Every structure is written in C-alpha cells, then in structure tokens.
Amino acid sequence: PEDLKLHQLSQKYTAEAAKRFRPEGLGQFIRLKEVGNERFRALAEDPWVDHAALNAKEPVKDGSRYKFIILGAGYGGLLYAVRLAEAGLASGPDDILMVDAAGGFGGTWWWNRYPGLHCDVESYSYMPLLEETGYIPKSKYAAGPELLEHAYRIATQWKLHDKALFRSNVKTIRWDDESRLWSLEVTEGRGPGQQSRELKLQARYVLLASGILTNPQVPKIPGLETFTGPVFHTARWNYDVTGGSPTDEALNRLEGKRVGIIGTGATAIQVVPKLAKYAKELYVFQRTPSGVWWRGQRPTDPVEWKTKIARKKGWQRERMLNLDSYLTDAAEEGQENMVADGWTEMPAFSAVIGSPRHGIVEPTPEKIAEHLGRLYKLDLPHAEQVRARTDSIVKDPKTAAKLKAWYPTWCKRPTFSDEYLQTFNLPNVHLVDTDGKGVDAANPSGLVVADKEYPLDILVLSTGYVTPSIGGGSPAVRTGVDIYGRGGKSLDDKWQTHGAATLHGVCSNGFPNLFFTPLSQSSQAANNAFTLDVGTEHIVQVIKTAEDRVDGDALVEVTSEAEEAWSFEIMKHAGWFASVTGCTPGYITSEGEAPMEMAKRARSGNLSQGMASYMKLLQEYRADGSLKGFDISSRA
Ligand SMILES: Cc1cc2nc3c(=O)[nH]c(=O)nc-3n(C[C@H](O)[C@H](O)[C@H](O)COP(=O)(O)OP(=O)(O)OC[C@H]3O[C@@H](n4cnc5c(N)ncnc54)[C@H](O)[C@@H]3O)c2cc1C
C-alpha cells in the first residue's frame, strides 16, 4: 500500500543516521572547563557574577554544619528549599545551605543569557510556583530575564538569600559512619587575583538538584585552540564582544563583522536570528539540522489568565498534566487542549517519554518490531509537516534541502521558531552543511569544511552541554562529584559495576540521607519543571514522614532488596526504549554509545508509562507512611 510504501522514509532516515556514526561516541566532545588550553577553559567562567558584592558578605566558615545541604540553586534546588520550608523541616537558621557554582540563583537561567533566549515550554506550565508567588508571566513563552527574575522572586519570597553559598564547586560528598553526617568538599571562587577558599561543610541530609545540561562542551575540532578571533560558548555569552546585554539585543559590535556559529540545536535556533540582524555576514555551521516547528509567541491576556489559566486552586499541576498527556500519547477524546501549542502535535514523542495507553512492550523481536512500526506510523504525519513547513519558508531549494531533518521526532529535542527558517532567506546568512560530518578543522583565521575554508572574525560555540545521560546516569558523574557512602563505598563504582540501583530514582542503598532528583529509573516529561515538581515533592514528603516517625532527626536508607526490586521493575520496561535504536546520534543515544550485560544496561532506563503514572505510583506509595523498603532509625 501507499501508507506502507511511504516507509522507504525509514530508508532515508537510516542513511542520514549512518552519515553521522562516530566510532568515538561521546569521545568527540570535551568539557570546556577541561580543555588543555587555559584561554579556552576560561570560556567556562561565570560572566555575570559580581565578585565585589559577594566578597563583601559574611563568608561561610570552614567546618560549618547544617540540617540540609542542597546542591543547586536553580528551579530544582529552589523547589526543594521551598518544599522543606512548607513541610516545616527548615525553620531554624542553619537548616538550609544551598550550594551552587553559579554566582547567584537560577541555575540554567543564571548561566544562559544569550540574545533571544526563551523557555521552549509554555511559561504558565514551566515557571514554578506561579500560584504561590502570585506572578503572572508576561507572555506565552518566557524570556531569560523574566526567568531569572522569577528565581529571585522565589528566593525572596522564601527568604533564601542568606542561605546560599555561590561560586562554589562541590567535589566530594562523603558519609562519616562515626558522626553520622555527610561532609562536602567545596571550593569557593573569590574573584580575579583572589585566592579560592577550600571549605568542608557538613549536613544530616544532602539533596542533589545538580541538573542535566550544566557543563558546556565543545567538539574536538583540530586546531580550534588556534583560531585568533574572539570565541565564546552560548552558555557563557560575551556581551563585550557582541555589544548589547542580557536585556539589550542590539548587538551593535557585530556590525561590519564576519560571525560564525557552530551548531543548530535549540540555542542556535533562538540566537541565529539575533546574530543575522547585526552581523555583516553570518555563517551557520551544521552537522545535523533541527526539526523546526512553529512557536506562536503571544502576550498574556488578562481575561484569558483568570478564565483559562489560573482557573482554580492547584491549577498549575493540572495544566502540566494536560500538556504532558499529548506527549505521552494519552490525550482523552474531547479533552480541552489547554496549552494548544506545537508540543501538542507530536504524539510520537511518547517513543522516548512513555505512554500509559499501550501496555508494556514484551521483549521478543516480533513485539519490538510491532512497537517500532506503531511509533514510526504515529510520527509520520507530524514529521512530514515539519519538512513541508521548511520547504515552504526557505526560498532557495538547496538551502531548504539542507535544513530538512530526516529522523523521527523523538530522536532530538524538538525546537520551535517563527523566525529561524526565514533567517536563511537573508542575503548575509549562509548555511554551511557538513554532510553529517561536522567541522573539519580550524585555523587562525577560521574553519575548514571539506577543504573549503571559511574565515571568521568572531566564533560562537552553540555546541551544547555534556549529555544528561553521562556515566550511565550515575548521579555522581552527572553532578561532577565523587560520592562515598557507608564503608567508603563509591556511588559511581556501584553504579558502573552492579548497574543503576535506586528506589523511585531518588536514593540508593549505602547512601543514607542522600537524595537526588530522579533521572535513571523513573520517568521524565518534556517539561522538566513537571519532573522536578513531582520529584522534589516525593523526596521532601518521604523525609517528612521519616522525621515525623522518629520525632525529628532521621536516618533514612533504602534497602538493597527494595532498590533491586525497583531495578528489576525498570528492566521490565526496557522494550519501550528500543524506540531509540534507529536514532541519529545525539545526547539521547549518547552519540550512538547507548550477553546479560544488556540487562545491566537496561537497569539505567525509565518506566515506560509516563509522568502521570509514575506520579500516581508515588502518591500511593506515600499514602500510609510505611515507607516500604526504607530502613528508618534515629540518626542520633
Ligand atoms: C539553554 C537551555 C534552555 C532550556 N529550556 C528549557 C525549557 O524550556 N523547558 C524545560 O523543561 N527545560 C529546559 N531546559 C532544561 C533545564 O536545565 C531545566 O528546565 C531546569 O532549569 C533545570 O533546573 P535544575 O535546578 O534541575 O538544574 P539547573 O538549572 O541546571 O541548576 C543546577 C545548578 O547546579 C550547579 N551545579 C551542578 N553541579 C555542581 C557541583 N558539583 N558543584 C556546584 N554546583 C553545581 C550548576 O552549575 C547549576 O548552576 C533548558 C536548558 C538549557 C541549558
């Protein structure tokens, strides 16, 4: 048939995926902060921190003790802090220390302030604690500054300003069997030509909200060190080079200049138009095009607000559920599509998120093939619309051809823009495709691709971050710390040797009083704030329960039995994620790197049924205070 014929599409998809097989896998990238050359490393530094201001506050003392240490002061760590405060667990003045390498609150929204930055999920669904702060976002999609200001709004509202230690890198988290406390080894930056302070900090509990897209990377492009013009990563934007500011997109200092951008991910989609407006020439260096769908940015309407958004108590959680029902292929028949944007048009995104509607995939080759066939057929209509949209906007057919993405929607993060594609209709903008191969080399005046050379004045690296999957999902690797628990046992060694092991994705046996936002062995939503909502609430509620059961000062530790049962649960769901086999490389296959070694690998994945289902499971689990599978006792 016609329908079945059209899957020679999956022949174009495997050809385009093959084109970019790299035998090195993740080995092609290096963290900015680990590059040999010091000039280069310095690109990872915080451009925004006011060291004078921070250096004048009372310093945190070496040997300080707290009830809770939270690693991370972005939306995730803020949610933990707010939840602890509302649970009645953090009333005392040393009950919370938040620690972050950033110079202030916001995480993602502290570091990234490049021109054009917006959240890609609806503001009303994404910004935390809207109902509790009373804040009304200005638009459908929030810009950086509004996002950062909201982080400040939260910290202000819950009086967190004097409970944070910034500019600080955590290196080690070590449990002490004797005193029953975690010790953190921390290095606090004090500004240029000042000595850093080495700190040892102790806590009863450590809560990690260390994030997932945290460590800007660059590709190992031969001779990149040697390019002599100004270079910067989008995650550490250089407004001195560019002109403008976080709240001024007039990039006056690009006028007359020849600007290069490596990468075509969400960041490039947002930045490219802003660069085109100012630069004399803009060269865009592409290895894999994004599928660019429509955005539909809109100012908030005050009638729509009280009628259709803030509809009642608890409205935001209901809205987040509504949005995610489209992405988990679960929207019921005549339900209201509350968000009604481009995310609600991609039901094959469930390939990578889960769905509660289709059962569990049995792990026979016939059942996997049927699952994949189903998902490929589900995706076909949206995927063909994305290519057609590109076809219609981009006037030159050669450039249109290169901008078309040929992979299932689920293989990369979808991107949304009403200006990016149109930007390539401008005369000063040149797409440089690398045929799946990437940039070849650099030299003092610019880059080389297939022996042609492209001279540049200013180079922008929109080459992304260390994958969220790093270290098979090890919470240690992902946060960039060594974690040692009972008997000096290393979290990461356990993870690598025995496989992923948690209960509900948030704790591990041997590591009492440590919790982490769930990544491995849980579920995820496109809307990360939803995940953080669910996960921070579960963690704080488990701790609340345990504290209440011992009448303050608990020691809470999942058993090996309970984590191992949960891990066999996760293995049962692994067939869902055969969906990822056919993917073009990207952070979701760990650039293609993702016997019974297979079941060890399977342990690091997720439930297959979506966020709502995981959430409900946690609610039922907490309901009777039993904390089944935890060893609870008095810490003192
Ligand atoms: C450019 C960009 C745009 C995005 N847009 C969206 C979106 O629209 N919707 C969405 O759902 N998601 C988006 N994301 C994903 C985003 O990371 C999450 O939505 C969210 O901001 C994460 O909150 P968090 O507090 O968990 O992590 P983060 O915001 O990453 O904060 C964690 C902080 O902890 C710090 N930290 C980590 N390790 C250490 C250590 N060892 N020592 C000290 N400090 C450390 C980090 O430096 C960082 O400051 C985006 C990500 C990026 C990078």
From Swiss-Prot:
SUPFAM superfamilies tied to this protein: FAD/NAD(P)-binding domain (SSF51905)
Family matches, as Gene3D superfamilies: FAD/NAD(P)-binding domain
InterPro entries, sorted: FAD-binding_Monooxygenases, FAD/NAD-bd_sf, FAD/NAD-binding_dom
Amino acids binding FAD: G76, D100, A101, T108, W111, C119, D120, Y126, V170, T479, N528
Stored Pfam families: Pyr_redox_2
Top-level lineage group: Eukaryota
pH profile of the protein: Optimum pH is 6.5 to 9.0.
A molecular-function term among this protein's GO annotations: oxidoreductase activity
Residues annotated to bind NADPH: T264, T267, T288, K412, V439, Y587
Family the entry assigns: Belongs to the FAD-binding monooxygenase family.
Name of the molecule in the record: Polycyclic ketone monooxygenase
